[PDB]
């Protein structure tokens, strides 16, 4: 499969999440995603085919993971925006107030701004600390997906948000949205990963 930020993958033939970013770990191909999406050794599929397995994850406390891929996968420095692509150019962290977008299999490509940092989410499994917050909308299934600026600086991966009874927060105003992402930089250093760029 071609590995593009925002696309759907399944975990152990059950849950669906979204790809974060193509990465390498030496000769090993991978993608980063959210930790709550899968447990270590869980099998990832795209287009019905096995593409790899969860190599490592921290959740709760943090919310991060990477999936180690078979050599047959094609890593791409891209995030889905409809039928088009945003090129991944680096991982410069944007400040509060910056515009940012996110990509995932449920709500697609959505934009907003970064509204806060160092936010704690209290999930059913426990607290996750240190999250960044934006007001781009999102929904169930977007977890793991890319957060990236329009200039191509990868920000993080989708963790969670204040979804409403329809499964998303797109039906409430931006001023009322809390859409939380795990910062990319600590994921890259914790696992020794390099971002695939173009």
From Swiss-Prot:
Q: Which cysteine pairs are covalently linked by disulfides here? A: 17-37, 101-111, 137-170
**Does this UniProt record's set of keywords contain Hydrolase?**
yes
Q: Please tell me one Gene Ontology term that the record gives under cellular component.
A: extracellular region
Keywords in alphabetical order, please: Disulfide bond, Hydrolase, Protease, Serine protease, Signal, Zymogen
Please give the superkingdom of this protein's source.
Answer: Bacteria
A GO biological process this protein is involved in? proteolysis
* GO molecular function list: serine-type endopeptidase activity
Q: Which residues does UniProt call coiled coil?
A: none
Active-site residues, as the UniProt record annotates them: 36 (charge relay system), 63 (charge relay system), 143 (charge relay system)
Q: Which family does it belong to?
A: Belongs to the peptidase S1 family.
The protein's name: Alpha-lytic protease
